[PDB]
Amino acid sequence: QSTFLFHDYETFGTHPALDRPAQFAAIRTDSEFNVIGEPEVFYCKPADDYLPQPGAVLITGITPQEARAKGENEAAFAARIHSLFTVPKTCILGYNNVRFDDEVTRNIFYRNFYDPYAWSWQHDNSRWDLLDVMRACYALRPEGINWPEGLPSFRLEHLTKANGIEHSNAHDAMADVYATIAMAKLVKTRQPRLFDYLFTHRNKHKLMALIDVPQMKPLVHVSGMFGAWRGNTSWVAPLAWHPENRNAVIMVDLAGDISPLLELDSDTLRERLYTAKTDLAVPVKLVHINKCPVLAQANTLRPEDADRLGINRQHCLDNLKILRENPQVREKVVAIFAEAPSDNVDAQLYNGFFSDADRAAMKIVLETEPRNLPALDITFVDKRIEKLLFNYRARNFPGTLDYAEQQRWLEHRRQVFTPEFLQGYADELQMLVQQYADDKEKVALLKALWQYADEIVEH
Numbered sequence: 001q002s003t004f005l006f007h008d009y010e011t012f013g014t015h016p017a018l019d020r021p022a023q024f025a026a027i028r029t030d031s032e033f034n035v036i037g038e039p040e041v042f043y044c045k046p047a048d049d050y051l052p053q054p055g056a057v058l059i060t061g062i063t064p065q066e067a068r069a070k071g072e073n074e075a076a077f078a079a080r081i082h083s084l085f086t087v088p089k090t091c092i093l094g095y096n097n098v099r100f101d102d103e104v105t106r107n108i109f110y111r112n113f114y115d116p117y118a119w120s121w122q123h124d125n126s127r128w129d130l131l132d133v134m135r136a137c138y139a140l141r142p143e144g145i146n147w148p149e150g151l152p153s154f155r156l157e158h159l160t161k162a163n164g165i166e167h168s169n170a171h172d173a174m175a176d177v178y179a180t181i182a183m184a185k186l187v188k189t190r191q192p193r194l195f196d197y198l199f200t201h202r203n204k205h206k207l208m209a210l211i212d213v214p215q216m217k218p219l220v221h222v223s224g225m226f227g228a229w230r231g232n233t234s235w236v237a238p239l240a241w242h243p244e245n246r247n248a249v250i251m252v253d254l255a256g257d258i259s260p261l262l263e264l265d266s267d268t269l270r271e272r273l274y275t276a277k278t279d280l281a282v283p284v285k286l287v288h289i290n291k292c293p294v295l296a297q298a299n300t301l302r303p304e305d306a307d308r309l310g311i312n313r314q315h316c317l318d319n320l321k322i323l324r325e326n327p328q329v330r331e332k333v334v335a336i337f338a339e340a341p342s343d344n345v346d347a348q349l350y351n352g353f354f355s356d357a358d359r360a361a362m363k364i365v366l367e368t369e370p371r372n373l374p375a376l377d378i379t380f381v382d383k384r385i386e387k388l389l390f391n392y393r394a395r396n397f398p399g400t401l402d403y404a405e406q407q408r409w410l411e412h413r414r415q416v417f418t419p420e421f422l423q424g425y426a427d428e429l430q431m432l433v434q435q436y437a438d439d440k441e442k443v444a445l446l447k448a449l450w451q452y453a454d455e456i457v458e459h
């Protein structure tokens with residue numbers, strides 16, 4: 001039986017790799033979004049070589065102390081998430097999960113020896129993200145839904161309130177999951193046909209049928225990169241598959257001005273594209289077919305819709321004709337992408353993939369009891385594993401370190417908690433206490449954050 005697994009993370013910071021998760025919540029439903037089973041909610045204990053971003057703690061109201069008292073170590077934390085995510089025929093989804101939550105999942109799995117990718121495709125599993133579904137709905141078929149404005153806001157809280165959906169205790173994983181389910185139900189109800197279209201075209205194979213590179217056939221694309229002033233929508237034309245990533249296609253925004261593509265050379269274009277802020281400026285962008293982007297046949301954007309959004313159909317077709325009569329453009333664009341770090345092992349998930357041999361060895365690591373990890377006599381090819389293993393043991397199984405390893409771990413913490421870092425931390429807390437002296441609830445959270453810094457980082 002196929003099902004949907006709505007989930008959400010509340011973290012101690014903004015970086016998917018460098019910050020740590022605080023709380024996780026997941027809810028399994030059926031094809032109609034009716035809850036099956038019970039809600040899953042648990043916390044993650046923070047390791048002793050990390051301090052939370054104060055701003056994040058003020059948002060969630062979750063202190064390191066609460067998380068430490070209620071949660072499990074990250075290895076156990078990951079174990080549970082991996083179980084929920086590996087149930088067959090599951091569509092793992094959330095709200096803005098493709099751009100944030102999934103990166104957290106990949107890093108948690110990475111740090112704790114689980115495959116960072118398999119969960120999203122094996123056993124007929126797949127993934128989706130309601131954020132872009134809301135944007136496509138607003139841009140193409142607005143009717144039946146109230147949209148917070150002075151431009152369209154797609155923050156979950158705003159959408160729920162604007163549509164009479166009870167969303168109290170926001171920024172609590174559990175509550176956000178319930179609100180996402182509510183939003184999904186709302187859209188499926190008020191815009192059934194668009195909903196199903198987006199759903200059935202989320203997978204790589206159905207997306208592929210829409211992309212016609214040789215002909216440069218136009219498509220409707222919804223991306224936050226286009227900007228709320230255009231409804232995050234435009235007409236794009238695929239120019240070529242990426243030279244080094246066959247899961248990426250180079251698209252040209254037909255609504256922009258293409259002269260830059262005609263006048264400048266590939267070196268210049270590359271400089272401007274590789275350093276610019278991602279906001280549509282060279283009218284070119286990449287679409288990763290494995291990240292469920294919103295793509296639809298051109299006619300989905302009716303003349304009425306174009307006018308409402310401000311998209312000049314004719315202008316787009318004019319550029320389309322030009323691109324077709326100027327083969328040299330396909331050359332320059334592909335040439336641009338024909339050319340593509342940290343010393344912290346936590347930030348090297350994307351340094352490369354692990355060979356089948358290392359995956360096998362890492363699998364044995366997962367079955368080995370912590371006490372025996374040191375005694376384990378396994379070969380590792382990838383240089384990252386050795387470092388990952390040491391952090392894994394020191395962070396989740398401290399009592400397992402020998403005397404010398406404890407000294408090394410102590411040295412490690414000293415190198416993280418440098419004088420400038422502690423001063424910056426105190427400066428921020430000082431600034432926040434001055435700003436929220438009144439709010440008895442916020443001051444309590446700030447007091448806790450300073451106490452926590454005292455015990456984990458002082459002396």
Ligand SMILES: [Mg+2]
Pocket residue numbers: 008009094095096097100101
């Ligand atoms: Mg989220």
